[PDB]
């Protein structure tokens, strides 16, 4: 059947904003996963997992009699999709069980790993999410094999449909770079927001870049892709060597024996895929990646044998039985055990990317340190494994259960505890009036609270107004935040704060994070008052202020808005049209299309634009909260054309006289062009809509102000 | 960006079931359009529409100074997409304002028509939907030009995204027949459920079939497409001649002058399209279809001139200025007015399809009668226009406002009014006990109520259990309904009913329609008891019994389920896979994916399959309401394979011994294969889910039993 996407493949896609409806969710609307998990007997789940590790099923026999390696790979691929550029991917939604990730070639045979866990999932039911279970199973694998983990937090609620993620534009799985849809340009520059080298890989190609078995060149791709997943050199070497202490790869025969991936398989396969025609199709005959490497002499026990082998042999380029490039130890004895036959042993083997840890000069230094000091290795791996598996979970207030590590880590963007009474409703009213009497304008108040709260992204639950990080580096100097104006507003608010807190007894005080949001609330109330409407904007205290020393400046860079349609801002010239970037930002904000539309229309007439641009400011009563944006955009008396100077700026002229009335960008005019957005604009631009517009605007403002408030969850 | 659809283009699409969520809807979840409409000053709206008719706008000047013909076309296109095969399309959701219909070639320049209406839409706001407005505007056009309409009902709630409809498989707009995705096969057989001859047409090609200007062959296409929109010969001739009493076509220059359709136009076009480079682009220079025909000597006044011209001249084949085939009256004088120049007149002209009304022998007779008896023409057209514009609105209980016609019409599937006391809860308990004491089984009770209720479709709100039409022709003889079993159940229920009604005082009685539903309820209650659960099923009385003479047998044929996955039924071999048909049916039933899943699982264990088929009956306790379907489907101890006899039937055998345990169809096994469906099955097949399964099943059972209960709305 031909679809709208077929006919108009470049039109903007609003359905990304309408996922995750209560319709698609089988749980009740009252289901609260955290409440279910907090009653789970986590110790009993772990005992069942521990038993499973050595309880081989004949339809996918356990290598060495132990599933630990397979489950550690499963948990590392679950977390491994994560990109710091947008926070999308990672383990936090259990997305490995849905398309497309369930069928990526790098996830081959993890369908078998997830199937092994269904009996446990079935026993415990809604009290443990798939998303938590995947991670927990990798921790229990590690523990079962003698490795002491750093801890574990539950709280990843399950999802029920695939996430909308840009994974690249290639139309061929595993396409080598340089094709018509190349994700590389320039001197091997990977396009943002991607974090893998080929479509359907986790990070890099285990043979080498585009299959070229050079460990030095492979190291460049390892470093780049791992940096794009928020991991530095130490963390990288710890993770790779740590993982490859366990288990083996599977390449016993030619890959042409392996059938359809799960989404393409027949119905009788009941959710599994890569059925193999080679010998038994499993166990000793398994084919997953096509490589056939076993790294250590004890694949089912933690050791420091990865580095002993890496450094204690010289390495020779060879081929697996599937034809893939891999390496074998020169002159070595057969000291590695076979996975099924106790009478067979094998020579040490390595992947090209393993040898990167010895041949790249910066990795070599760390690998050597870890080789000489395996206690340092164990500690770095444990910390990195925790970070890997929790990086998308958001603030530590979301972490559940009895194994949460107490140590506060800088990557968590930590918020200090609140240890004093909070302001009440009367205090909030007094502080709003003080803010308004200071002479700060609606535009200043709204702009500053917008800037603070709108760093949030639901993809990894980073950002938001909690922390008052807007006053710190690097946020205070981001161009979108209008540094000189921001500094003047923050100075006035800090004076208000000092005076209020100095007057209290009993230790009550207000944080600057709370006052920034409260001040934005006073601005919106004042704009409504300027329009003739008395409203109260809701406000919930309890935010705290983080220090510079608790803020990783380099990690914060990815939260910089380089495109923020809500402030009609674009930092420079992109390939993707600005309206597509607006929709992307609304998705990260967790907004629907109606929420996006109301919010943008109001912000324009409040004076939220960066630099006080007139683009889209379709009103003659700026700083009054009215539906004027919609009424004027919809006025057929105005004709619009692109300017000669700039095809992305439009002039609106009176159709009859030619007089200039307005200017706008693509982000403004999309609301009058897109057939779904225009239909929303019509509702708010109708003669009966002023009350509705104000109410809906206040509701979406308060939603944005509270996005990171998992302390009130 | 590559999407799951790109990778796996034949996968099933569940997002059709989660459309129309409260997320995409700008109105609050409590908004009730019926209540808004009932307060609308409909008389004021009509006055504004009357004024608009002759208020010409310079950007799309009114032909003959009067927009009436353009608006009649606009309303007839809004209604004209309707297909009786599935009830999809029609005017009832205002879908002409969204993709793809806003940009269909046959809808060219109706974007102008809808834009002219925005000021009225703006003024009245939420109190009149677009969908009602398009139809009311067509009514007012007719009345303004001297034609008295049969009536009008409001109540068509607006929708906020495109409907998921199969419009065909062609990838080229307007593709002629016989291509790689031909909608025709055999002797000009149109594929169900399509009701138009080419992609992006309303019904037929105005030049003739595939552009061949043969009026006799065109008549065959007219008759077939109109029948597939629920219109017979009389209604068809009345509609065509009636419409073509007004206005004109537009084909002033070559079609190569017309630019992009609205969904392809640039952002500056602000929602309009088909911008023309021919002369002024508009008015006298307009190009819409490419034809240039004006039918009558008074295009802005109702007249009997259509048939005078059709019969009073002989016709010669000619070309419009765009090169399209049309007809001109041989030897006629220049009697037709020009739309813009008072000094110009034109000869009478006709479309091929107009000439069909004279040259097809069965139409000719009707046309002549209308020519000779113009009052019969006026009456037929009035009634057909009402039917055209209301055929998708459902039961008369949904009709709102002060212009609703009192006359009850056969195509409304009318239900008699209830004029007696209804049964109360004590009566309901006594009747359930009687049903259970009669010896009717769970399987019999559930199957019969399912058969009665599940004819409903939300596309045109036809069908459902109200009316007890399951006892009448043709429902009582449908193969899916198991005619011999149905007859035995109905005979026992009618004897129960006769005995209850014969014992009452006052006028209290129970309809058979209510008793069928009630008896189904007692079945479900008994099945829960068989499983150890104490469950009360909600029941609402008030259904009435329709007569045979109130049940048009030919119109009822389209509700026949030829595929019903809920009863594992397929009437024959189709090209579309059965699991796609299941999803299609769930959409017509208004079900979400979780509802479809829970419903199907329960029906299988209750014995609702046609012919007592064992396929999907994954339980050892049939007629007990348990989650066994899910627990057994998910058991990895069973391996599944297609049979040699039949690739659509699957055997599930013990993995270790090979012993046969179950058989299933595609509909059954999709729940274990599709990655989304399997995620829902896992919830219900978990150890903690039995009570949830029961309660969710009772909820969705009750939902289906009430689909058509617009008397309680
Ligand atoms: C440069 C990064 C990496 C590359 C290129 C890579 C490559 C691979 C490949 C090709 C396999 C074989 C799949 C199969 O044929 O069964 C695999 C196995 C595995 N990897 Fe990695 N890997 C990477 C990093 C990691 C990380 C970070 C960890 C975990 C901390 C991990 C843990 C494992 C384990 C445990 C296995 C064994 C699976 C089994 O026993 O079934 N690897 N690796
Ligand atoms: C065989 C069925 C029909 C065919 C092929 C058809 C074809 C068309 C065509 C090609 C146009 C010209 C579009 C343009 O260039 O502006 C048109 C105009 C129109 N049709 Fe039809 N028609 C059909 C039935 C109907 C019916 C059922 C109605 C209404 C009851 C209707 C009412 C009109 C009106 C009022 C116009 C004039 C528009 C104007 O004045 O702007 N027609 N028809
Ligand atoms: Na994420
Ligand atoms: Na419909």
- Beta carbons of B405 and B386 less than 8 angstroms apart: yes
Q: With contacts defined as CB-CB under 8 Å, which chain A residues touch B597?
A: 26
B649 beta partners: B665
- The CA A97 to ligand 3 mean position distance, Å, reads 15
Calpha distance B228→B85 (Å, rounded):
7
Query: How buried is residue A239: exposed, middle or buried, by Cβ count under 10 Å (0-12/13-18/19+)?
Result: buried
Calpha distance A623→A621 (Å, rounded):
6
Active site residues of B: 77
Closest chain A residue to the Cα of B677, Cα to Cα = A160
Calpha distance B388→B391 (Å, rounded):
6
- Beta carbons of B523 and B449 less than 8 angstroms apart: yes
B251 beta partners: B287
Calpha distance B533→B489 (Å, rounded):
26
SS3 assignment, position B353: helix
For B79, the token pair is: 């209604």
Q: Find tokens 């594992």 and name the residue.
A: B568
B189-190/B184-185 β-pairing: antiparallel
Contact flag B673-A267 (C-beta cutoff 8 Å):
yes
Contact flag A687-B1 (C-beta cutoff 8 Å):
no
Distance of CA B610 to the CA centre of its chain: 26
What one-character-per-residue DSSP string does A77-98 give? HHHTT--TTT---SSTT-GGGS
Query: Which of B1, B262, B680 is closest, CB to CB, to A166?
Result: B1
Q: Does ligand 1 come within 6 angstroms of the Cβ of A236?
A: no
Q: How far B300 CA sits from the closest chain A CA (Å)?
A: 26
What one-character-per-residue DSSP string does A679-703 give? HHHHHHTSTT-HHHHHHHHHHHHHH
SS3 assignment, position B101: helix
- The CA B634 to ligand 1 mean position distance, Å, reads 29
Flag whether B244 is marked binding.
Answer: yes
Calpha distance B441→B446 (Å, rounded):
9
- Beta carbons of A554 and A642 less than 8 angstroms apart: no
First to last CA, chain B: 44
Closest chain A residue to the Cα of B4, Cα to Cα = A100
SS3 assignment, position B577: coil
Q: How far A562 CA sits from the closest chain B CA (Å)?
A: 21
- The CA B72 to ligand 2 mean position distance, Å, reads 8
What one-character-per-residue DSSP string does A236-273 give? HHHHHHHHTTS-B--BSS-GGGB---GGGS-GGGTT--
First to last CA, chain A: 43
Give the ranges where B481-620 is alpha helix by DSSP (H): 483-502, 512-530, 553-556, 578-588, 593-606
Show the CA angle centred on residue B529, arms to residues B590 and B684, nearest 5°. Answer: 45
Distance of CA A49 to the CA centre of its chain: 28
- The CA B239 to ligand 2 mean position distance, Å, reads 10
Mutate to test the interface with A, among B158, B160, B675, B693 (most CBs of A within 10 A): B675
How many other CB atoms are there within 10 angstroms of residue A458's CB atom?
A: 18
Calpha distance A492→A431 (Å, rounded):
13
Backbone angles phi, psi at A371, to 5 degrees: -60, -50
Calpha distance B20→B341 (Å, rounded):
48
Q: How far B212 CA sits from the closest chain A CA (Å)?
A: 26
Measured over the CA atoms of residue B175, residue B180, residue B181 and residue B184, the dihedral's sign is positive
Instruction: Please state which architecture CATH assigns to domain A408-564+689-713.
Output: Orthogonal Bundle (1.10)
* Residue (of A681, A395, A435, A686) closest to A542 by Cα position: A395
Q: Find tokens 């800088």 and name the residue.
A: A410
Residues whose beta carbon lies within 6 Å of some atom of ligand 2: B 63, 69-70, 72-73, 76, 203-204, 206, 222, 239-240, 242-244, 246-250, 288-289, 291, 353
SS3 assignment, position A450: helix
Calpha distance A68→A146 (Å, rounded):
11
CA R_g for chain B: 28
How many other CB atoms are there within 10 angstroms of residue B41's CB atom?
A: 11
For B324, the token pair is: 């399209």
How many other CB atoms are there within 10 angstroms of residue B4's CB atom?
A: 17
For A272, the token pair is: 């599994």
* Rounded-to-10 torsion of CA B604, B610, B612, B614: -50
* Residue (of A677, A476, A139, A159) closest to B675 by Cα position: A159
* Rounded-to-10 torsion of CA B584, B588, B591, B596: -40
Query: Which of A1, A162, A670 is closest, CB to CB, to B267?
Result: A670
What one-character-per-residue DSSP string does B625-650 give? --SHHHHHHT-TTEEEEE-SS-TTEE
For B170, the token pair is: 């062609």
SS3 assignment, position B162: coil
CA R_g for chain A: 28
**Secondary structure element (H or E) that encloses residue B563, with its range:** strand B563-564
- Beta carbons of B180 and B170 less than 8 angstroms apart: no
Contact flag B8-A264 (C-beta cutoff 8 Å):
yes
Q: How far B103 CA sits from the closest chain A CA (Å)?
A: 10
Query: Which of B11, B166, B171 is closest, CB to CB, to A263?
Result: B11
Measured over the CA atoms of residue A5, residue A10, residue A16 and residue A17, the dihedral's sign is negative
Q: Would you call the peptide bond into A474 cis, given omega within 30 degrees of 0 as the criterion? A: yes
* Residue (of A559, A508, A522, A517) closest to A540 by Cα position: A517
CATH superfamily of A565-688: Peroxidase, domain 2 (1.10.420.10)
Calpha distance B388→A565 (Å, rounded):
44
Q: Does ligand 1 come within 6 angstroms of the Cβ of A70?
A: yes
- CATH topology for A1-167+373-407 is Peroxidase; domain 1 (1.10.520)
Calpha distance A223→A229 (Å, rounded):
10
Contact flag B15-A14 (C-beta cutoff 8 Å):
no
How many other CB atoms are there within 10 angstroms of residue B284's CB atom?
A: 15
For B318, the token pair is: 């000619």
B638 beta partners: B654
Sequence ranges of the domains in chain A: 1-167+373-407, 168-372, 408-564+689-713, 565-688
- The CA B390 to ligand 4 mean position distance, Å, reads 10
Using alpha carbons, list the distances in angstroms from residue A278 to A250, B276, B427: 12, 63, 68
SS3 assignment, position B485: helix
Q: With contacts defined as CB-CB under 8 Å, which chain B residues touch A593?
A: 23-24
- Beta carbons of B326 and B351 less than 8 angstroms apart: yes
Catalytic residue among A66, A77, A346, A533: A77
Calpha distance A490→A545 (Å, rounded):
13
Q: With contacts defined as CB-CB under 8 Å, which chain A residues touch B656?
A: 58
Calpha distance B594→A20 (Å, rounded):
13
Calpha distance B128→A390 (Å, rounded):
51
For A156, the token pair is: 């990843």
Using alpha carbons, list the distances in angstroms from residue B704 to A350, B449, B578: 61, 10, 21
Backbone angles phi, psi at A276, to 5 degrees: -110, 135
Count of alpha carbons within 13 angstroms of residue B168, beta-carbon side: 30
Q: Which atom of ligand 1 is nearest to the CA of A206?
A: 5
Domains A168-372 and A565-688 agree in fold: yes
Calpha distance A118→A272 (Å, rounded):
13
Calpha distance A173→A101 (Å, rounded):
12
Which of A64, A73, A326 is the best mutation target for the ligand 1 pocket, counting ligand atoms within 8 Å of the beta carbon and taking the most? A73
Contact flag A267-B11 (C-beta cutoff 8 Å):
no
Distance of CA A595 to the CA centre of its chain: 22
* Residue (of A496, A503, A542, A501) closest to A519 by Cα position: A496
Using alpha carbons, list the distances in angstroms from residue B315 to B327, B349, B447, B627: 6, 8, 60, 71
Q: Would you call the peptide bond into B474 cis, given omega within 30 degrees of 0 as the criterion? A: yes
Calpha distance A440→A447 (Å, rounded):
11
Calpha distance B447→B486 (Å, rounded):
9
Contact flag A271-B678 (C-beta cutoff 8 Å):
yes
B325-329/B349-350 β-pairing: antiparallel
**Any residues with CB less than 8 A from the CB of B28 and at least 6 apart, and which?**
none
**Any residues with CB less than 8 A from the CB of B472 and at least 6 apart, and which?**
B546, B547, B548, B551
- Beta carbons of B377 and B370 less than 8 angstroms apart: yes
* Residue (of B428, B610, B621, B599) closest to B519 by Cα position: B428
For A152, the token pair is: 């574990």
For B199, the token pair is: 């992609």
Q: Does ligand 1 come within 6 angstroms of the Cβ of A72?
A: yes
Calpha distance A418→B50 (Å, rounded):
66
SS3 assignment, position B654: strand
- The top-level CATH class assigned to B168-372 is mainly alpha
Q: Would you call the peptide bond into A270 cis, given omega within 30 degrees of 0 as the criterion? A: no
* Residue (of B255, B204, B225, B222) closest to B84 by Cα position: B225
Annotate B234-301 with three-state secondary structure: HHHHHHHHHHCCCCECCECCCHHHECCCHHHCCHHHCCCCCCECCCCCCHHHCECCCCCCECCCCCCC
Using alpha carbons, list the distances in angstroms from residue A595 to A115, A456, A480, A693, B27: 39, 16, 22, 11, 11
Count of alpha carbons within 13 angstroms of residue B366, beta-carbon side: 19
Q: Does ligand 1 come within 6 angstroms of the Cβ of A167?
A: no
Extract the annotated binding site of A for heme b.
Answer: 244
Q: Find tokens 């077939």 and name the residue.
A: B224
A350 beta partners: A327
Backbone angles phi, psi at B137, to 5 degrees: -60, -40
Count of alpha carbons within 13 angstroms of residue B147, beta-carbon side: 33
Mutate to test the interface with B, among A29, A98, A126, A268 (most CBs of B within 10 A): A268
* Residue (of A28, A27, A3) closest to A15 by Cα position: A3
Closest chain B residue to the Cα of A97, Cα to Cα = B675
How many other CB atoms are there within 10 angstroms of residue B509's CB atom?
A: 16
Backbone angles phi, psi at A588, to 5 degrees: -65, -35
The length of chain B in residues reads 713
Contact flag B2-A268 (C-beta cutoff 8 Å):
no
Using alpha carbons, list the distances in angstroms from residue B222 to A225, B195, B231: 62, 10, 10
Q: At what angle do helices B512-530 and B593-606 cross, to 10 degrees?
A: 80
What one-character-per-residue DSSP string does A4-37 give? HHHHSTTS--GGGGG-S-TTT--S-TT--HHHHH
Closest chain A residue to the Cα of B594, Cα to Cα = A26
- Beta carbons of A272 and A263 less than 8 angstroms apart: no
Backbone angles phi, psi at B665, to 5 degrees: -100, 180
Residue B674 DSSP one-character state: S
Calpha distance A29→B28 (Å, rounded):
18
Using alpha carbons, list the distances in angstroms from residue B460 to B101, B158, B547: 18, 14, 21
* Residue (of B663, B655, B652) closest to B617 by Cα position: B663
Query: Which of B5, B270, B686 is closest, CB to CB, to A672?
Result: B270
**Any residues with CB less than 8 A from the CB of B695 and at least 6 apart, and which?**
B535
Contact flag B59-A21 (C-beta cutoff 8 Å):
no
SS3 assignment, position B95: helix
How many other CB atoms are there within 10 angstroms of residue A122's CB atom?
A: 18
- The CA B287 to ligand 2 mean position distance, Å, reads 14
- Beta carbons of A144 and A50 less than 8 angstroms apart: yes
Contact flag B168-A1 (C-beta cutoff 8 Å):
yes
* Residue (of A81, A79, A53, A201) closest to A131 by Cα position: A79
Query: How buried is residue A85: exposed, middle or buried, by Cβ count under 10 Å (0-12/13-18/19+)?
Result: middle
Calpha distance B590→B407 (Å, rounded):
30
For B445, the token pair is: 């009770």
Tell me which method was used to determine the 3D structure. X-ray
Closest chain B residue to the Cα of A666, Cα to Cα = B267
- Beta carbons of A132 and A79 less than 8 angstroms apart: no
Calpha distance B80→B90 (Å, rounded):
6
Distance of CA B123 to the CA centre of its chain: 30
Calpha distance B9→A5 (Å, rounded):
13
Q: Which atom of ligand 2 is nearest to the CA of B204?
A: 5
Q: Find tokens 């069908």 and name the residue.
A: B463
Mutate to test the interface with A, among B8, B21, B26 (most CBs of A within 10 A): B26
Q: At what angle do helices B215-227 and B233-243 cross, to 10 degrees?
A: 110
Q: Which ligand is nearest to the CA of B203?
A: 2
* Residue (of B264, B391, B237) closest to A674 by Cα position: B264
Backbone angles phi, psi at A362, to 5 degrees: -75, -40
- The CA B386 to ligand 4 mean position distance, Å, reads 16
For B140, the token pair is: 């007012």
**Secondary structure element (H or E) that encloses residue B388, with its range:** helix B374-390
- Beta carbons of B421 and B507 less than 8 angstroms apart: yes
Backbone angles phi, psi at B363, to 5 degrees: -60, -40
Calpha distance A231→A216 (Å, rounded):
19
For A453, the token pair is: 């709260």
Query: How buried is residue B224: exposed, middle or buried, by Cβ count under 10 Å (0-12/13-18/19+)?
Result: middle
Give the ranges where A373-413 is alpha helix by DSSP (H): 374-390
B325 beta partners: B319
- Beta carbons of A545 and A467 less than 8 angstroms apart: yes
Closest chain B residue to the Cα of A161, Cα to Cα = B676
Show the CA angle centred on residue A658, arms to residues A652 and A663, nearest 5°. Answer: 20
> Which residue, judged by its Cα, is nearest atom 6 of ligand 1?
A206
Q: Which atom of ligand 2 is nearest to the CA of B248?
A: 40
């Amino acid at each position: 059947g031909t679809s709208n996407r077929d006919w108009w493949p470049n039109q903007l896609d609003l359905s990304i904003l309408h996922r995750h409806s209560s319709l698609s969710d089988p749980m009740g609307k009252d289901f609260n996963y955290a409440q279910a998990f907090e009653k789970l007997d986590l110790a009993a789940v772990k005992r069942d997992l521990h038993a499973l590790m050595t309880t081989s099923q004949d339809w996918w026999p356990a290598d060495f009699g132990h599933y630990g390696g397979l489950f550690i790979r499963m948990a590392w691929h679950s977390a491994g999709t994560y990109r710091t550029a947008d926070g999308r991917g990672g383990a936090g939604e259990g997305q490995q069980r849905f398309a497309p990730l369930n069928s990526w070639p790098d996830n081959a045979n993890l369908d078998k790993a997830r199937r092994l866990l269904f009996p446990i999932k079935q026993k415990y039911g809604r009290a443990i999410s798939w998303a938590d279970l995947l991670i927990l199973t990798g921790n229990v694998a590690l523990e079962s094999m003698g490795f002491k983990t750093f801890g574990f937090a539950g709280g990843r609620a399950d999802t029920w449909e695939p996430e909308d993620v840009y994974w690249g534009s290639e139309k061929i799985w595993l396409e080598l770079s340089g094709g018509p849809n190349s994700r590389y340009s320039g001197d091997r520059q990977l396009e943002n927001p991607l974090a893998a080298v080929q479509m359907g890989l986790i990070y890099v190609n285990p043979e080498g870049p585009d299959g070229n078995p050079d460990p030095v060149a492979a190291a460049r791709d390892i470093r780049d892709t791992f940096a794009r997943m928020a991991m530095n050199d130490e963390e990288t070497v710890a993770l790779i060597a740590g993982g490859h202490t366990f288990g083996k790869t599977h390449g016993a025969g030619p890959a042409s024996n392996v059938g359809a991936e799960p989404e393409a398989a027949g119905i009788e396969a009941q959710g599994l895929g890569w059925k193999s025609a080679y010998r038994t199709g499993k166990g000793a005959d398994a084919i997953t990646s096509g490589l056939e490497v076993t790294w250590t002499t004890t694949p089912t026990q933690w050791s420091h044998n990865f580095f002993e082998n890496l450094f204690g042999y010289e390495w020779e380029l060879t081929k697996s039985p599937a034809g893939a490039h891999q390496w074998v130890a020169k002159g070595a004895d057969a000291v590695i055990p076979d996975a099924f036959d106790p009478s067979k042993k094998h020579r040490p083997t390595m992947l090209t990317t393993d040898l990167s840890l010895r041949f790249d000069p910066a990795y070599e230094k760390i690998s050597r340190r870890f080789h000489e000091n395996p206690e340092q290795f164990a500690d770095a791996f444990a910390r990195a494994w925790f970070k890997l598996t929790h990086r998308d979970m958001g603030p530590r207030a979301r972490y559940l259960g009895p194994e949460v590590p107490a140590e506060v880590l800088l990557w968590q963007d930590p918020i200090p505890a609140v240890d004093h009474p909070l302001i009440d409703a009367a205090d909030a009213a007094e502080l709003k009036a003080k803010v308004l009497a200071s002479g700060l304008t609606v535009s200043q108040l709204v702009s500053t609270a917008w800037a603070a709260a709108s760093t949030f992204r639901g993809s990894d639950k980073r950002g938001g107004a909690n922390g008052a990080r807007i006053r710190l580096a690097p946020q205070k100097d981001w161009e979108a935040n209008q540094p000189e104006q921001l500094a003047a507003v923050l100075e006035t608010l800090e004076a208000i704060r000092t005076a209020f807190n100095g007057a209290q007894r009993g230790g009550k005080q207000v944080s600057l994070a709370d006052l920034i949001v409260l001040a934005g609330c006073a601005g919106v109330e004042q704009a409504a008052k300027n329009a003739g409407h008395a409203v109260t904007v809701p406000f919930a205290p309890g935010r705290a202020d983080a220090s510079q020393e608790q803020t990783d400046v380099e990690s914060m860079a990815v939260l910089e808005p380089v495109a923020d349609g809500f402030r009609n801002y674009l930092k420079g010239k992109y390939r993707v049209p600005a309206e597509v970037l607006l929709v992307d930002k609304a998705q990260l904000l967790t907004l629907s299309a109606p929420e996006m539309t109301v919010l943008l229309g109001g912000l324009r007439v409040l004076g939220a634009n960066v630099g006080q641009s007139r683009h889209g400011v379709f009103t003659a009563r700026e700083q009054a909260l009215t539906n004027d944006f919609f009424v004027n955009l919809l006025d057929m008396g105005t004709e619009w054309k692109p300017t000669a100077a700039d095809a992305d700026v439009f002039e609106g002229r009176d159709r009859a006289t030619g007089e200039l009335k307005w200017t706008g960008t693509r982000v403004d005019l999309v609301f009058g062009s897109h057939s779904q957005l225009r239909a929303l604009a019509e509702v708010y631009g109708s003669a009966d809509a002023q009350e509705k517009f104000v109410r809906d605007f206040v509701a979406v403002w308060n939603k944005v102000m509270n996005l990171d408030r998992f302390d009130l969850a």
